[PDB]
Design an enzyme around this catalytic site. Structure first.
Site, PDB file in Angstrom:
ATOM      1  N   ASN A 282     -61.027  26.287  31.410  1.00 54.54           N
ATOM      2  CA  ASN A 282     -61.688  27.168  30.433  1.00 54.54           C
ATOM      3  C   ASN A 282     -63.193  26.991  30.549  1.00 54.54           C
ATOM      4  O   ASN A 282     -63.658  25.866  30.717  1.00 54.54           O
ATOM      5  CB  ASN A 282     -61.236  26.879  28.989  1.00 54.54           C
ATOM      6  CG  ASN A 282     -61.805  27.875  27.995  1.00 54.54           C
ATOM      7  OD1 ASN A 282     -61.409  29.049  27.972  1.00 54.54           O
ATOM      8  ND2 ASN A 282     -62.749  27.421  27.172  1.00 54.54           N
TER       9      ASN A 282
ATOM     10  N   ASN B 279     -61.578  19.946  32.831  1.00 57.68           N
ATOM     11  CA  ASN B 279     -60.973  20.733  31.752  1.00 57.68           C
ATOM     12  C   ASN B 279     -59.566  21.197  32.128  1.00 57.68           C
ATOM     13  O   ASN B 279     -59.231  22.383  31.986  1.00 57.68           O
ATOM     14  CB  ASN B 279     -61.871  21.942  31.423  1.00 57.68           C
ATOM     15  CG  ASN B 279     -61.965  22.238  29.932  1.00 57.68           C
ATOM     16  OD1 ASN B 279     -61.613  21.391  29.107  1.00 57.68           O
ATOM     17  ND2 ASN B 279     -62.398  23.441  29.579  1.00 57.68           N
TER      18      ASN B 279
ATOM     19  N   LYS C 136     -20.928 -10.539  32.658  1.00 56.55           N
ATOM     20  CA  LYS C 136     -21.366 -10.684  31.251  1.00 56.55           C
ATOM     21  C   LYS C 136     -22.894 -10.590  31.075  1.00 56.55           C
ATOM     22  O   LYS C 136     -23.386 -10.019  30.097  1.00 56.55           O
ATOM     23  CB  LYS C 136     -20.821 -11.984  30.617  1.00 56.55           C
ATOM     24  CG  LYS C 136     -21.192 -12.159  29.132  1.00 56.55           C
ATOM     25  CD  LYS C 136     -20.497 -13.350  28.471  1.00 56.55           C
ATOM     26  CE  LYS C 136     -19.000 -13.108  28.281  1.00 56.55           C
ATOM     27  NZ  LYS C 136     -18.734 -11.835  27.553  1.00 56.55           N
TER      28      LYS C 136
ATOM     29  N   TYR D 234     -14.042   8.204  24.605  1.00 54.40           N
ATOM     30  CA  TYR D 234     -15.044   9.284  24.733  1.00 54.40           C
ATOM     31  C   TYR D 234     -15.988   9.177  25.929  1.00 54.40           C
ATOM     32  O   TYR D 234     -16.343  10.194  26.512  1.00 54.40           O
ATOM     33  CB  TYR D 234     -15.905   9.391  23.486  1.00 54.40           C
ATOM     34  CG  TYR D 234     -15.264  10.055  22.278  1.00 54.40           C
ATOM     35  CD1 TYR D 234     -13.884  10.033  22.082  1.00 54.40           C
ATOM     36  CD2 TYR D 234     -16.064  10.647  21.294  1.00 54.40           C
ATOM     37  CE1 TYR D 234     -13.317  10.606  20.968  1.00 54.40           C
ATOM     38  CE2 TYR D 234     -15.502  11.220  20.171  1.00 54.40           C
ATOM     39  CZ  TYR D 234     -14.132  11.190  20.014  1.00 54.40           C
ATOM     40  OH  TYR D 234     -13.579  11.754  18.901  1.00 54.40           O
TER      41      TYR D 234
ATOM     42  N   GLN E 168      -4.703   9.551  25.610  1.00 47.28           N
ATOM     43  CA  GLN E 168      -6.021  10.034  25.998  1.00 47.28           C
ATOM     44  C   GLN E 168      -6.982   8.890  26.292  1.00 47.28           C
ATOM     45  O   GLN E 168      -6.813   7.778  25.776  1.00 47.28           O
ATOM     46  CB  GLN E 168      -6.632  10.861  24.868  1.00 47.28           C
ATOM     47  CG  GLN E 168      -5.935  12.167  24.569  1.00 47.28           C
ATOM     48  CD  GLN E 168      -6.766  13.031  23.647  1.00 47.28           C
ATOM     49  OE1 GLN E 168      -7.008  14.194  23.947  1.00 47.28           O
ATOM     50  NE2 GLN E 168      -7.244  12.450  22.538  1.00 47.28           N
TER      51      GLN E 168
ATOM     52  N   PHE F  14     -56.472  24.524  28.991  1.00 47.71           N
ATOM     53  CA  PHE F  14     -56.493  23.051  29.104  1.00 47.71           C
ATOM     54  C   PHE F  14     -55.468  22.379  28.170  1.00 47.71           C
ATOM     55  O   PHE F  14     -55.245  21.167  28.258  1.00 47.71           O
ATOM     56  CB  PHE F  14     -57.890  22.516  28.745  1.00 47.71           C
ATOM     57  CG  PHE F  14     -58.425  23.081  27.452  1.00 47.71           C
ATOM     58  CD1 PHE F  14     -57.849  22.733  26.224  1.00 47.71           C
ATOM     59  CD2 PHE F  14     -59.463  24.004  27.460  1.00 47.71           C
ATOM     60  CE1 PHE F  14     -58.305  23.292  25.039  1.00 47.71           C
ATOM     61  CE2 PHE F  14     -59.933  24.551  26.275  1.00 47.71           C
ATOM     62  CZ  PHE F  14     -59.355  24.196  25.066  1.00 47.71           C
TER      63      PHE F  14
ATOM     64  N   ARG G 264     -13.992  11.015  28.660  1.00 46.20           N
ATOM     65  CA  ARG G 264     -13.355  12.298  28.360  1.00 46.20           C
ATOM     66  C   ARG G 264     -14.337  13.329  27.748  1.00 46.20           C
ATOM     67  O   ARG G 264     -14.179  14.554  27.925  1.00 46.20           O
ATOM     68  CB  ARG G 264     -12.123  12.067  27.464  1.00 46.20           C
ATOM     69  CG  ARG G 264     -11.550  13.311  26.797  1.00 46.20           C
ATOM     70  CD  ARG G 264     -10.182  13.070  26.159  1.00 46.20           C
ATOM     71  NE  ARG G 264     -10.145  11.958  25.206  1.00 46.20           N
ATOM     72  CZ  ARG G 264     -10.257  12.091  23.881  1.00 46.20           C
ATOM     73  NH1 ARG G 264     -10.433  13.293  23.335  1.00 46.20           N
ATOM     74  NH2 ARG G 264     -10.195  11.027  23.095  1.00 46.20           N
TER      75      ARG G 264
ATOM     76  N   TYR H 182     -69.686  29.793  27.529  1.00 43.37           N
ATOM     77  CA  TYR H 182     -69.343  28.439  27.076  1.00 43.37           C
ATOM     78  C   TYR H 182     -69.288  27.443  28.225  1.00 43.37           C
ATOM     79  O   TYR H 182     -68.674  27.708  29.265  1.00 43.37           O
ATOM     80  CB  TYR H 182     -68.020  28.373  26.286  1.00 43.37           C
ATOM     81  CG  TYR H 182     -67.576  26.944  26.104  1.00 43.37           C
ATOM     82  CD1 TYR H 182     -68.135  26.146  25.108  1.00 43.37           C
ATOM     83  CD2 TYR H 182     -66.658  26.366  26.975  1.00 43.37           C
ATOM     84  CE1 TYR H 182     -67.773  24.820  24.966  1.00 43.37           C
ATOM     85  CE2 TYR H 182     -66.283  25.046  26.846  1.00 43.37           C
ATOM     86  CZ  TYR H 182     -66.839  24.279  25.836  1.00 43.37           C
ATOM     87  OH  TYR H 182     -66.486  22.964  25.701  1.00 43.37           O
TER      88      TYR H 182
ATOM     89  N   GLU I 126     -62.120  14.907  18.148  1.00 42.43           N
ATOM     90  CA  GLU I 126     -63.366  15.405  18.733  1.00 42.43           C
ATOM     91  C   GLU I 126     -64.187  16.197  17.695  1.00 42.43           C
ATOM     92  O   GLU I 126     -64.294  17.423  17.776  1.00 42.43           O
ATOM     93  CB  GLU I 126     -63.083  16.226  20.013  1.00 42.43           C
ATOM     94  CG  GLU I 126     -64.302  16.472  20.907  1.00 42.43           C
ATOM     95  CD  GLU I 126     -64.699  17.939  20.990  1.00 42.43           C
ATOM     96  OE1 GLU I 126     -63.827  18.774  21.280  1.00 42.43           O
ATOM     97  OE2 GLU I 126     -65.884  18.275  20.773  1.00 42.43           O
TER      98      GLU I 126
ATOM     99  N   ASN J   4     -62.911  19.390  16.323  1.00 42.46           N
ATOM    100  CA  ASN J   4     -62.748  20.539  17.223  1.00 42.46           C
ATOM    101  C   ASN J   4     -61.321  20.671  17.723  1.00 42.46           C
ATOM    102  O   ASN J   4     -60.781  21.721  17.716  1.00 42.46           O
ATOM    103  CB  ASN J   4     -63.728  20.514  18.420  1.00 42.46           C
ATOM    104  CG  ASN J   4     -63.640  21.756  19.297  1.00 42.46           C
ATOM    105  OD1 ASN J   4     -63.476  22.823  18.826  1.00 42.46           O
ATOM    106  ND2 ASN J   4     -63.763  21.590  20.550  1.00 42.46           N
TER     107      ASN J   4
END
Ligand SMILES: *N[C@@H](c1ccccc1)C(F)(F)C(=O)O
Ligand SMILES: *N[C@@H](c1ccccc1)C(F)(F)C(=O)O
Ligand SMILES: *N[C@@H](c1ccccc1)C(F)(F)C(=O)O
Lengths: 634, 639, 635
Positions: free
Chosen positions: B336, B212, B408, B303, B300, B352, B306, B70, B436, B439
């Site tokens: 490839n 590739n 600000k 978030y 506490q 690839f 903490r 190929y 493609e 493919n």
């Protein structure tokens, strides 16, 4: 290999009878899914009782001494500056406040899983919940009692967990299931299982609600399903190779050694093994040896790029499983009581962000799995790309009244399309919540729900794909038997008509070379590929060498004899799979599920056939053929 | 700890001089980033030369002898049915057809192009590609000479088109433009001429071998992952600085909380934060702050502080795991067919396919959005008096707040930054088209994804620059605050004596002086409607009732009048003096000192002529060019 | 028809010389786009002067008398409870505070000049309280090509970017200004070079300058101009697609659309029927489906047949968003709104860019839809199974093993569409509670407009590739027609010379007509390819239907081999229906004016070089010339 780990999960799901909850033994996503889905699975809470009572005693005594501890002698969330000595009232007002969902529900499976996960959290001895409340949770779980819980309201799981607490304290407005057939107010449900409503002690309201139990519950069954469906998709890539006439070289170990993503090596290693001594790969080699230079050198991506594609998907699903199990086995609660060091620790273990983020990733990976299935299915449906198979896998022979799996094909596009949409993240939509106290929040339950919806679609897609592949197996097997007939009829008729050796060779090559499904509809139609090739040969044999009379007679005798003998073998048919590693799948779908080759002569609709396959996937019967197929892989 | 690993990355990025390219020593994301960004860094191709030559001669022989392989004796992609013995023309035709990008210029930057050339050169060293060693040498020379083709930004589904421009350079295509240094662009034939190279004539498989690969996607992913590691560590670290300025409770990082919810990123981030905050002079002030009117103040923290370790956990894990994935790709034969010359076969696969990088790029963009949201929440708390525990709104020094809106503008930009960032973090990988001639019915889109994550990181740099600038403002405000409170105490103390007030009055008044947040009355300390004189008035009335006379009332009225005369002068004086310390004992000193001294900034106010842009620009530039790692490393010293 | 409105926009863009800004004459998106892109376009501020000075006077007086008015005697945003009599310093403190962007990248000069135009226009309504003299300065800056350099990001919609224009006007040393294309100097030197002095801000002036939607709306205006042009261009090219693909033009039949009357469906189909009526290519298509009729598709695939249904919401979205954006251009986007006639400062939120924001999200989705249509059409054109005789990849060959045609462009089309689809997710769904929770809803319109702009860059790329491919397809269709005739002549003449019976001649001539020429162009007399394959079947058939005949047929086959390829090569070399086509202007523009040719191994220019030319012409507006010729006489 992850393949071993997933088979380990399937076995555990099937084999577990008791889930021991003891503060030390891990609960896996299989344990959780087994509890949710198999009613014979029981919880066994193991008297970690010592550490529970110490923690419990510490919390109540400190609270009575007037120690300043969040949510035990203080207000909740953004109200944490308010102090109070109204210990039980504080806890009760929290539950009241959180019974705030609306029925426009989270299912019993999720709710029971949440109950188990909360019970598990308590065993670590950091919560200050009473042992007796834990025993009530275990009893409720084993008695199939569960509150009806609204679907929405959590940013991750205060509101949904308040319904479990509501049940435990006997809130009249909370409705409980007892099995699948009974719904009663909470006090009646407690009564029927020999329990009395609890009076919340210090921290007990907060301890019951301050967890990630619903997000993690849905995520656990999501992850169990994702592992199983992942293995199913990887495995079925091999069945796809077999039916499509793929080249198994794509799974060669050196290709993946040299690009060593763990999911890539491991999926390829599975695929190499599945295809090693395949009867269908033998046919594939035969197919490409006929007119080799008029046929593709390589497969298209859906097969050839499958290990590279699967790699991040395997790894995401494996890693997310670890993360979810860590959460299952955690003290998700706040404050965390460190009684050994005489202090309450203020943090954010209720924050379900590990789970939420990984839910976003897995939904993306599940979409990637759906795309692969869609690409493979598309190839299978198009004669240009299916290497001899008929369009839509239509048996015909009359294709004008047999559109084959075209319905399933359209549906696959709808499935993939919605799936890709679902895979956008939930985690990017963080609102500043609860009087701006919760200015980050994980949205893990919402994310887990979307990943669960994505997997529902994936199941649809897998059922369809497997059904088409079974159709394709029958069509490949019929193809082989049909070609042998054509060859036999051509050979014997050439003899009878006393044609020369030159002629007989040319005609027999045509009979072997032209794909049978191009002319099955009308074998002696002079405009279809069999007779087209035959006429080409006959002219060539005339140029190369009465002879005409014997050729015209051949064409008449073929016109009389051939279709009849083709119909005979076809009707008989209505084998290579016997040597395939995918035999268990074919046997499962055809025999156990009672199906057959799809055609206008079969009364069953595609719905009827795919429904059976889907149901077997949804309920886990699909793991039997899966485990048989994988038998001996190591 | 991932903290050790990231410090390692930073060290490697700063210290590397030669990147050895030898087919066995791994290239890390730090090496790629250093090649891309430090032009004194050189590539050293180590003559793996044997297996390379074996491979290329194997391919040439097979092709000449008419072997069916190929992309060597076969057409490409969907056309793999087509055979040809036209070996060189086949490869030439691939490059011509792939030169199909358009310049909109938008282009892949030189940094990504050079990184891509390195990664292609690296793939080739594994000896699976069939490329001639001399082409590899050419790549080394182009890299070391700072010559790069100009490459169109788009066209890859992951990297045929972009890689075709590197191939185009090598074969001397006149239409391909090349950079030489930062100031010169010439056609490809002239660029080769200037570095002593002649155009190559493509041999069997050479055009395909060049194109590739996953080189571009992986190049951008490498610098993305390098930046993601550094910025992550920076965000984690600055969470500790946030605690210090916001008056957080460092308990959130206690090791037991996290042992009991043991996500690796949760334990490791909390471990860092506990260390950063142990023995903190700012945490000392925090403890004192909550000891005063304890029961009127939150038990506490919110978030954004903490819950930071729980939030960071998956973010750390995603970024670390993606770094491994990307480095595995950098160190792979992405090509490839894969030539197994030992066993005389060309193996047909899909190396690839950049799917590993593509999916992780999507995950990381999500993680980065999570880091942005964490910063946005922390920044938001800092700007709001109700959540900042004594700090003025917008971190406005004032004292006249009607003509000082502080940070600000930065606050507004932070919302704009987060909003776009959250948008960017949608997946690319869900948009796979069948490509493609059908493919490429699956394709990774990794380069597109990597570009979006890079964009996400651009915005995160902006947010970190703003957040650090704000926290340095807050440091100054905390230190001035402590000084101002001591002055208020002294003035109230001495004036109480001098006006002959009873000891129970003096003690009441001194409580007020300690307890009222100074920034609530700095604007006009003796405004009778502002919180200082409010508290003083209440205390004075209570004194009259408790000791219940005309002399007391005279002396109390005198106290108020004289405080009215002196306090503002004294408060103004210490502020002006400050504009002309606890950070010295803080692990964050190198950050404050870097921003204030090395970058030359000061407390922001109406009296400082520099705009917020000018201040944030300096910090941003330092983050962009890596200078920020200096105070990061100093800060983390001993961990 | 929307077709007429878009032609109207194009003509206005091309023809405008002076943009009149007077508080009453509408400014269109074509006006904004022309100011941005054609520097010979000037601004004419028409001394609305009286209402401006009255409003200005009103504010100064009211402020000095200590009236209580937001942002003139009070703090800004979340700080509106603070009052002050320090009128100028208040305005100065705002600009200082908002000069807070960072250069990573910048808003382009085109967008900044458009923003200056839009702010100036807002002021003409006499609700802002800005001085007339500041407006003259803005006009002068516009007409003299002076622009501040502006950070890309910071706006939630446009305080920070507009503060850069304000910063220029007050001569902030840190604000950098462009003068033309090459000069960049600090703001006070820039003012000096055009004879201006720095303004000292009066009451409300800082706020009036920054409190608008000028940047979002600027970008949105050029976005909408391009969206209209590219929409009409895609609609038109659907017709060209039909012609090259051998489509059936019946898909545009007016009854189909009368019966499903979405206005965009009716109008795009009407355009397409007109473009395709009596087309010479449609005549070739009709011929094609008559040869072996029962073996070819009765209907086209959706990319063509479903185009008017697909285009309908896209047309409607782009037209309605144009109206929406223009309503914003022509608005007093400011706060407070001064109702001087009734002595009230009205407290509202005309700075909120939400109409533009949501519509930018909608338009980006519509652009993604247009990209999808182009992708699907391009995909069909590349695949022999669906192109009705065209070679795969539109490869000329003849040797296909060294000619992969437009495969590179095909791959790129997938990459373009993919990223475009991603871009089309909404921005407006990401509202953060901003600015000390004062801005708890905000439009994000500038961000959204930027993304739609990015999506249109890609669409331009996609249209450029598609048009290039269709020109290639025109050449290949005309070559095909010439090639079939050549084969028919060679077959006919060689049948005579070999003395073949009429029966034979008839059969062979039908094969010559029926076999798509591109299936055997590579090697016309290869016995394994469709021509000789069809010829041999017919020869066996003629022998059955009727030994000297065999000699003659063998002689025909040998003669054809000597002769056919050379005859085909000659006509192809020479070549290396459109004249009767409405798409002639496009073909002629691309081939002649842009100087291109059929793509093959024998042409040196790369696909990049060909597509670049077409892209540049789309980008700069030269594409509108062939478009206007093509559409001449429509309605
Ligand atoms: N999870 C938070 C909370 C808020 C409101 C009610 C109950 C719990 C919390 F952060 F405040 C916590 O419980 O720690
Ligand atoms: N990557 C694919 C290709 C397609 C067109 C031109 C070159 C390469 C391929 F799958 F075909 C491959 O090269 O393996
Ligand atoms: N747009 C807002 C504002 C905020 C900060 C500075 C200037 C303007 C506002 F809503 F408050 C307004 O101007 O109306």
């Amino acid at each position: 290999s992850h393949v071993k780990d997933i088979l380990g999960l399937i076995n555990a799901f099937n084999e577990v009878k008791k889930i021991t909850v003891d503060g030390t033994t891990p609960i896996t996503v299989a344990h959780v899914a087994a509890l949710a889905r198999r009613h014979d699975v029981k919880v066994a809470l193991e008297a970690c009782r010592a550490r529970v009572e110490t923690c419990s005693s510490w919390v109540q005594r400190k609270a009575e001494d007037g120690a300043d501890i969040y949510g035990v002698t203080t207000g909740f969330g953004a109200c944490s500056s308010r102090r109070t000595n109204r210990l039980s009232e504080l806890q009760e007002s929290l539950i009241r406040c959180l019974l705030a969902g609306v029925f426009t529900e989270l299912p019993a499976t999720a709710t029971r899983s949440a109950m188990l996960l909360r019970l598990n959290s308590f065993t670590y001895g950091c919560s200050g919940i009473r042992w007796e409340v834990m025993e009530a949770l275990e009893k409720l779980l084993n008695s199939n009692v569960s509150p009806k819980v609204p679907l929405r309201g959590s940013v991750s799981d205060l509101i949904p967990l308040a319904y479990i607490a509501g049940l435990l304290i006997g809130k009249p407005s909370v409705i409980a299931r007892i099995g699948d057939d009974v719904e009663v107010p909470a006090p009646e449900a407690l009564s029927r299982v020999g329990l009395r409503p609890f009076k919340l002690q210090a921290k007990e309201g907060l301890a019951l609600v301050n967890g990630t139990s619903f997000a993690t519950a849905v995520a656990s069954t999501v992850m169990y399903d994702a592992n199983v469906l992942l293995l199913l998709v990887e495995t079925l890539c091999g069945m796809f190779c077999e039916v499509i006439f793929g080249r198994e070289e794509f799974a060669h170990p050196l290709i993946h050694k040299v690009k060593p993503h763990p999911g890539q090596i491991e999926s390829a290693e599975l695929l190499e093994w599945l295809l090693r001594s395949s009867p269908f790969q033998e046919l594939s080699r035969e197919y490409y040896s006929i007119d080799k230079l008029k046929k593709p050198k390589q497969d298209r991506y859906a097969l050839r790029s499958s290990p590279q594609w699967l790699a991040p998907l395997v790894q995401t699903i494996r890693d997310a499983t670890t993360t979810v199990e860590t959460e299952v086995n955690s003290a998700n609660d706040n404050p965390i009581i460190d009684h050994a060091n005489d202090r309450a620790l203020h943090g954010a273990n209720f924050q379900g962000s590990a789970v939420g983020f990984y839910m976003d990733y897995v939904r993306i990976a599940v979409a990637g799995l759906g795309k692969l299935l869609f690409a493979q299915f598309t190839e299978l449906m198009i004669e240009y790309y299916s290497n001899g198979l008929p369009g839509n896998l239509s048996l015909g022979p009359d294709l004008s009244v047999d559109y084959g799996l075209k319905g399933l094909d359209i549906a696959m596009a709808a499935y993939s399309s919605e799936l890709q949409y679902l895979a956008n993240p939930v985690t990017t939509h963080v609102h500043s919540a609860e009087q701006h106290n919760q200015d980050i929040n994980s949205l893990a339950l919402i994310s887990a729900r979307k990943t669960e919806e994505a997997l529902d679609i994936l199941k649809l897609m897998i059922a369809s794909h497997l059904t088409a592949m079974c159709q394709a197996v029958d069509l490949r097997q019929l193809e082989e038997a049909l070609v042998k007939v054509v060859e036999n009829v051509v050979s014997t008729l050439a003899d009878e008509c006393g044609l020369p050796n030159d002629t007989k060779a040319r005609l027999l090559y045509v009979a072997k070379a032209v794909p049978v499904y191009t002319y099955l509809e009308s074998p002696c139609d002079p405009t279809l590929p069999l007779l087209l090739g035959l006429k080409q040969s006959c002219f060539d044999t005339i140029l190369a060498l009465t002879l005409v009379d014997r050729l015209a007679e051949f064409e008449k005798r073929l016109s009389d004899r051939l279709e009849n003998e083709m119909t005979a073998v076809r009707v008989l048919y209505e084998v290579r799979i016997q040597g395939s590693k995918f035999l268990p799948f074919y046997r499962f779908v055809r025999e156990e599920l009672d199906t057959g080759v799809m055609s206008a002569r079969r009364e069953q609709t595609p719905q009827e056939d795919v429904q059976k396959v889907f149901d077997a996937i949804a309920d886990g019967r699909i793991t039997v053929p899966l485990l048989h197929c994988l038998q001996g892989f190591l």
